[PDB]
Design a protein around this nucleic acid. Structure first.
Lengths: 354, 257, 299, 125, 196, 256, 257
DNA sequence: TTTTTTTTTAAAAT
DNA sequence: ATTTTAAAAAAAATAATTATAAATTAAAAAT
DNA sequence: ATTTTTAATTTATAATTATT
């Protein structure tokens, strides 16, 4: 699911694309972020003893708190986020949906088996795996992003595809998603492990497609044939193709049709009803939303209805949320630095690499 | 095999004392007409244009267009090994990991050679254009170094305004506004302590101060500095050496919201 | 499983351990020390040594011990009951009472938690050598940068190799084994705690011990007293504790620099508001100056 | 002011034990000190060991000689005044040390030995 | 409740109540050297004046049982020879240079307990060694001090006082200051002549 | 409204170099008869007196009795902007709590303005007694700062006394007890190295040392300083800066 | 009655400021020809001695011999009081537990009667041979100190080499390599610049940079320096003084297999 | 009804 | 000797709490 | 005026439970 080992492939054979930067190096920078898999991050991460963090109304107050404090963590450093929400899943995701429903079913059967067993850490693990995101998490966090004024988008097909759409038009600088296919979707600059904590102090891995297409020596279609050859969530993968031999195979034949024209069918068969062409068309051209159709503005977060909803419906502390929105407002007041690359073109220039 | 000699030795020591606190690694690009170094820092806040023309060299030579990716801090530390009057002589090679820096005595009682590793680099070459600037302010670099060095202690962001009478340096913070009105001194014809402003459009743009302490560290290169400002353009800080070449420093302005 | 030595004496250092097995009396074993008690403002401070033979390191890795930072107390108790049964898994701990660490770090010498931590570590590995446990590898995940720590431990102990790093509970088995032994030992010490002093309307259930816990904060604000502050169970040098001692309890300043810092004295408030103070030798002879005798004034 | 001393409070008082703090406190009056200070006395390797506000307190009883019996006194244009207790044993405490011969209170013990000598009446010749 | 005090007194205080119901009484009279109020205790059953000296030293306090007491105030109720307080009023009364009976010698309005100083037998026995008619003699009083200093030469020999300034011929400098806490500076400044 | 322009305000630069390490927040006594300063230090050991008469300025406007609450470390960092030969004007609003320093170039090449924020601090003035001091010593400031650094190198115990062979700045320490001996009266006609001593009573008392190093940060103010020693009083250290103003420092001694 | 008065103890205060970072505790000796030192450092790596001739002292009267147990940080803090022209004097008894120092004025105004305490230490004097050296190098000491400070920041090791044609200061750090030629400038005849290098056999040793940085701290008491080496002997850095004694600085060579 | 990363022991073929 | 499908599996934040530090921070101090 | 040579500052790791 996703792309298997693409970050492992860049770490192995093409390490010039990785820029291990710190979080403070984007002072005044506009970036699109996948929201729903961060909600998955805050449903598997914000768990106390296996019990999910809830209020007295019985609603999940975990992810609202977690990604509200994520917005505070980005904005207090000086980064304006852009959030996109995955809506309609694409029609090629049927096998991934079948595998997801199968692992849901065996995880819930394991949940009742461990509940009959009486253990507790297995209950913690299976409740970490089982809890999924419906529309309640999505529209509650959409109301939350309306409640601070940082803009939020509804992606028609894929969230990272909408990130690729708003970065190809230059509305944002990057896509900050730990799922790799937005590089294959067309987003130049990926940010990896941006959802790591402030106290974890993990540096942020940057992935530029300029260095990827330079060091791999490929165009967009050859790189996405490489990433389908490692394996996509929509289609299947060929049994018996690795990372490095697929890199050599794209460097040899440059297209999956010529690859299966010059492979061994007696040893390496394709799956039945193999649809790499329409998957290739979908990764080149997904159904995205227009970046120019929406205007970008990061308004002042209104406070009184924020604290009214957040303390009545969700029953939180007054001081923490009030200090958080005060930090958001004074960070918006004092993070007004402008970047120098906006007024120039870009061109690579190497040294005598010997 | 690139070999270069130069008469006034300490100009390289002063400019690499400037580059060391801002640029940690740089690519030394050899051209036909001189040495060029267009670098841009690790946080995308600055840009440095080192035009080191071949007219200022003693015996300049150029086989091909070399580009040495150089970690600049340790080699700046060993360029500091030369004295204030020591003659700087360069030697290089194409297929080599070492750059040779020859340091010799002015009375030639001592001739020394230093080498270092050149860890190879990849630099994004953001091409600077040529454009009209609304407020071209030629103004003393000792005075500019004074103003930025003591506006460091008042806050974080200076706002630079200008008019026909002079130029404004207004830095704010928790400790009030340090608004400095430098008078345009067109009455006196001094070479060093002269403030001349080209009057095209009165611009009001705001800048950084800690980063300005990282730029303004080389007032003994040129005693005067050309400040070129226009509307929402990057800054031009010109450190003109009269025959070595024109050194240019670039800062993006702070945006408003 | 021994705990009665904690019950009979919990003021100084107390030793709770397991006896040396037969195979660990001959084989050069491995060593592991980690932490529980450096965190909270309540409770004791527990460092533990686990010990196991060199071929059994893969068995200890297959015992599922290294994930011992995101656990629950009943699961901690049943895994503790799992590793206490086998003969090759033995634990030895020198628990440090809050009396001992508070009387350490509040003397004339401003003593340090990391300094007392390495002193307890050195005494622990010396007692582990003197018990007949032959070892060669020492794996401690202590707090701080570990290179000068390794140099100090190698200068103190040259015969046994000391290998210390940072965040080593997820990397070495015996480190996380000592961590979970110290954690279950701390929870055993605080969930079955008896005091030294006598009390009335007491509550043993106080909270988890850590200062941001609400039950611990409520107990910490309801058992505060003006004359003595707290019993022996509570640390007396921590910022929440020092905050509520300076708030609720009376002003107690000592003969050393206990937030007074007086050298030379004779402030000018007693030199200008008062015009002339009396220069009488109230200690007229040097006997009363050297022995602190002053004439009586009033009742 | 004239402060009469009651003579009935000298005989009926009860022996007890007293402890001396090596620092100062801001409170005078009632305090649960036998609840905490008395049961935490540990007979360690160097006498009596106890902790108060985290400071280690090493101390011992200082031998008050006979001919010197301690009295504990409560305050009360003529006036009365009235005691509550008598003793002979008091416990010096030093902060993580035994004060010993460097103590100003152990040196104050020999001043009634001086005051039995400086105030002896000289007989006639 | 209120402030609370600690004494250290001989057991001869206890057996001086079988005659008078309230025969002990805590009063304030003149300091023997400075000339101000100090806390004394007087008897007429056993009839000895007792001086109270406090241990007022910095940073000490008392754990009174089930109570507290700050200040470190240890009071030393010790017997005192009354002749210092006698000679203060005699050198006050010698200023007009006349004989004067004891009813109008010890007169002071700030310390109103001067009635107590006239009821002591052996007053003339003490006054013979330093001086009905009463006139102060300085030279006979400076004969009495060698019977007090050299007595404390032998007495502090038993007390084992380290009288050295590096903190017989050294006890004389040390007993110079011991009586100087109980006599004024006009009476002890000439004792350097009288130690020869 | 304030109009207080001085010809050379390097005197102001030197006094705020001499105050920014001893006192953090203090009070400037604003009056119509000059500029005064009166504030105890961080632990009530030293009081300040900069009795700066207003005759040195071009003009002097004082509309009402301003209770000035100023912190001196940050506004000393503000005053460090000015040059050694710079022209400095001080301006403050009549009803606002904001002080606006003006710096002006010698050859009129710039006009430099520092608006800076302030808050209303407490004002606690005290009176001054005057007595015929026991030992008044005229002795220059630079050698005084040198020997205070020298006795700071010794330890943390210094004793000051005078005698008929001269003053001694005797310092005791664990390194060893050392002496600094000067002449009673100097025959040198050069006034920057002349030491003379007025004596009424020789006496020895013990001082602190970090406060002495705080006192000797006024080294380039004046060439000579007159120090008057007396017992059971704070010291008087009269840094006389020509005729425009004088600086005084107080130090109550140690107890033995 | 041990005394030592000098008109100008500039050499004394310079070497006693310099040696404060070499030896923490260095016991002196009282000799007939002056003061003597023979002390090892805390890591037992570098050796130093002090020998001052008793000619130029004003009042140097020696009665007997006594090992002066001397703390060198006490010498640093007690000769830091000396100024540009403070006239030093030493004063001691036969068995004084302390040592008094007097610093009078040229105009007889100030007298600094300072006293230092003595600490008792075990005294050992290692046997040091005196012979003829393989290469004797005479060069300016200020130039030696600044180029030692130059090539010490380039790494951690130094290779010493000399010949009749020149003297090689080779040093190969982890950053790079740096080598210094010295030319024989005996045609130029100055006080320190008269470079005279006599040679017998070209020998090569390795030494330590950071301890040479400790050794170069006694520069401006003597503007000249003599260098002298042989095979597997300690290098003798000679800070000889033309009127007041000599300073010979020792360091054992490293081994490289 | 809507997200996938990370090693690793692992059997197994170029 | 390597290369690696595949099975499994771990598995994921975050402001608050504190002690303990670590390069940063003006500043003496000497060129 | 730089560049030391330090000390006394401001934010840094390693932990814990909860944060609800």
């Amino acid at each position: 699911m996703g792309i298997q080992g693409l970050a492992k492939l860049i770490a192995d054979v093409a390490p010039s694309a990785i820029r291990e930067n710190d979080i403070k190096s984007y002072f005044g920078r506009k970036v699109a972020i996948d929201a729903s898999m961060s909600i998955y991050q805050f449903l598997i991460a914000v768990r106390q003893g296996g019990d999910v963090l809830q209020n007295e109304e019985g609603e999940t107050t975990s992810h609202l708190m977690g990604m509200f404090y994520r917005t505070i963590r980005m904005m207090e450093n000086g980064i304006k986020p852009v959030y996109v929400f995955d809506g309609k899943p694409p029609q090629l995701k049927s096998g991934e949906l079948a595998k997801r429903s199968e692992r849901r079913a065996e995880a819930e059967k394991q949940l009742q088996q461990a509940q009959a067993a009486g253990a507790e850490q297995e209950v913690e693990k299976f409740t970490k795996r089982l809890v999924k995101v419906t529309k309640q998490h999505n529209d509650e966090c959409k109301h939350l992003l309306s409640l601070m004024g940082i803009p939020y988008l509804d992606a028609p097909s894929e969230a990272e595809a909408s990130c690729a759409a708003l970065v190809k038009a230059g509305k944002v600088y990057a896509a900050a998603t730990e799922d790799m296919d937005c590089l294959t979707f067309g987003s130049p600059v990926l940010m990896r492990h941006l959802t790591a904590s402030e106290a974890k102090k993990l540096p942020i891995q940057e992935f530029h497609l300029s260095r990827i297409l330079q060091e791999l020596g490929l165009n967009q279609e050859q790189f996405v044939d490489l990433c389908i050859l490692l394996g996509s969530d929509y289609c299947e993968s060929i049994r018996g193709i690795g990372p490095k031999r697929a890199v050599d195979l794209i460097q040899k034949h440059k297209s999956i049709e010529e690859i299966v024209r010059r492979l061994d069918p007696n040893k390496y068969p394709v799956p039945e009803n193999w649809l790499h062409k329409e998957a290739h068309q979908l990764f080149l051209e997904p159904e995205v939303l227009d970046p120019e159709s929406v205007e970008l503005k990061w308004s002042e977060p209104n406070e009184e209805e924020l604290i009214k909803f957040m303390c009545g419906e969700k029953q939180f502390s007054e001081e923490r949320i009030r200090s958080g929105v005060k930090r958001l407002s004074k960070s918006r007041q004092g993070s007004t630095q402008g970047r120098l690359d906006d007024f120039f073109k870009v061109t690579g220039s190497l040294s005598s690499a010997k | 095999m690139f070999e270069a000699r130069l008469v006034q030795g300490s100009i390289l020591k002063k400019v690499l004392e400037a580059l060391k606190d801002l640029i940690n690694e740089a690519c030394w690009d050899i051209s036909s007409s001189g040495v060029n170094l267009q670098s841009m820092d690790s946080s995308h806040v600055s840009l440095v244009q080192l035009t080191l023309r071949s007219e200022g060299f003693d015996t300049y030579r150029c086989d091909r267009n070399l580009a040495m990716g150089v970690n600049l801090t340790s080699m700046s530390k060993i360029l500091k090994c030369a004295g204030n009057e020591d003659i700087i002589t360069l030697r290089a090679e194409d297929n080599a990991d070492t750059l040779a820096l020859v340091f010799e005595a002015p009375n030639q009682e001592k001739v020394s050679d230093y080498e270092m590793k050149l860890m190879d680099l990849d630099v994004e070459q953001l091409g600077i254009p040529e454009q009209e600037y609304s407020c071209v302010v030629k103004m003393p670099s000792g005075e500019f170094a004074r103003i930025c060095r003591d506006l460091s202690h008042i806050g974080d962001a200076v706002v630079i305004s200008c008019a026909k009478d002079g130029v404004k340096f207004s830095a704010s913070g928790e400790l009030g506004n340090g608004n400095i009105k430098l008078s345009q001194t067109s009455n006196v014809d001094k070479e060093e302590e002269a403030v001349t402003i080209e009057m095209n459009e009165p611009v009001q743009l705001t800048f950084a101060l800690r980063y300005l302490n990282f730029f303004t560290k080389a007032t003994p290169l040129s005693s005067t500095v050309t400040l070129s400002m226009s509307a929402d353009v990057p800054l031009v800080v010109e450190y003109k050496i009269a025959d070595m070449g024109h050194l240019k420093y670039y800062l993006a302005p702070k945006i408003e919201d | 499983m021994d705990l009665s030595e904690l019950e009979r004496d919990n003021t100084g250092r107390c030793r709770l351990s397991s006896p040396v097995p037969a195979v660990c009396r001959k084989e050069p074993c491995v060593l592991g020390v980690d932490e529980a008690g450096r965190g909270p403002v309540l409770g004791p401070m527990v460092y533990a040594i686990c010990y196991c033979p060199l071929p059994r390191l893969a068995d200890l890795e297959a015992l599922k011990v290294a994930d011992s930072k995101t656990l629950l107390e009943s699961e901690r108790e049943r895994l503790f009951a799992k590793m206490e049964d086998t003969d090759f898994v033995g634990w030895a701990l020198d628990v440090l009472s809050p009396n001992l660490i508070s009387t350490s770090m509040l003397g004339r010498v401003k003593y340090n938690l990391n300094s007392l931590s390495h002193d307890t570590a050195t005494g622990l590995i010396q007692y582990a050598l003197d018990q007949g446990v032959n070892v060669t590898q020492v794996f401690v995940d202590t707090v701080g940068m570990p290179e000068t720590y390794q140099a100090r431990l190698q200068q103190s102990f040259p015969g046994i190799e000391v290998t210390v790093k940072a965040k080593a509970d997820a990397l070495y088995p015996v480190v996380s084994a000592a961590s979970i032994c110290a954690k279950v030992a701390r929870d055993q010490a605080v969930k079955k705690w008896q005091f030294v002093e006598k009390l009335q309307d007491l509550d043993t259930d106080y909270g988890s011990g850590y200062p941001n816990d609400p039950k611990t904060k409520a107990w910490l604000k309801e058992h505060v007293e003006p004359v003595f502050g707290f019993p022996q169970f509570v640390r007396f040098s921590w910022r929440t504790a020092q905050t509520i001692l300076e708030k609720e309890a009376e002003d107690v300043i000592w003969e050393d620099s206990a937030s007074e810092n007086q050298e030379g004295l004779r402030k000018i408030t007693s030199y200008f508001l008062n015009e002339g103070s009396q220069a009488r030798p109230r200690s007229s002879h040097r006997y009363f100056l050297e022995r602190g005798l002053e004439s009586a004034t009033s009742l | 002011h004239r402060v009469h001393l009651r003579s009935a409070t000298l005989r009926d008082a009860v022996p007890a034990t007293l402890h001396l703090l090596p620092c100062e406190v801001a409170v005078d009056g009632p305090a649960p000190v036998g609840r905490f200070f008395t049961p935490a006395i540990r007979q360690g390797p160097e006498g009596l060991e106890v902790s108060f506000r985290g400071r280690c307190l090493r101390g011992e009883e200082v031998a008050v000689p006979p001919g010197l019996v301690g009295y504990v006194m409560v305050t009360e244009f003529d006036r009365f005044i009235g005691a509550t207790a008598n003793f002979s044993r008091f416990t010096l405490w030093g902060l993580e040390t035994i004060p010993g011969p460097d103590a100003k209170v152990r040196g104050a013990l020999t001043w009634p030995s001086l005051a039995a000598a400086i105030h002896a009446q000289v007989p006639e010749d | 409740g209120a402030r609370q005090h600690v004494f250290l007194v001989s057991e001869y205080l206890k057996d001086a109540s079988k005659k008078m119901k309230n025969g002990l009484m805590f009063v304030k009279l003149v300091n023997p050297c400075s000339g101000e109020g100090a806390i004394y205790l007087f008897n007429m059953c056993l009839q000895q004046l007792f001086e109270v000296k406090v241990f007022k030293e910095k940073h000490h306090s008392w754990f009174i049982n089930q109570s507290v007491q700050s200040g470190g105030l240890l009071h030393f109720a010790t017997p005192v020879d009354p002749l210092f307080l006698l000679l203060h009023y005699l050198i006050k009364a010698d200023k007009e240079g006349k004989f004067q009976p004891l009813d109008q010698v010890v007169v002071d309005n700030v310390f109103p307990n001067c009635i107590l100083l006239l009821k002591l037998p052996g007053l003339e026995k003490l006054l013979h060694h330093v001086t009905k008619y009463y006139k102060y003699s300085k030279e006979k009083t400076l004969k009495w001090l060698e019977k007090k200093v050299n007595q404390t030469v032998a007495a502090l020999k038993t007390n084992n006082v380290n009288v050295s300034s590096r903190v017989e011929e050294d006890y004389i400098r040390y007993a110079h200051g011991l009586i100087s806490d109980y006599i004024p500076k006009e009476l002890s400044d000439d004792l350097s002549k009288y130690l020869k």
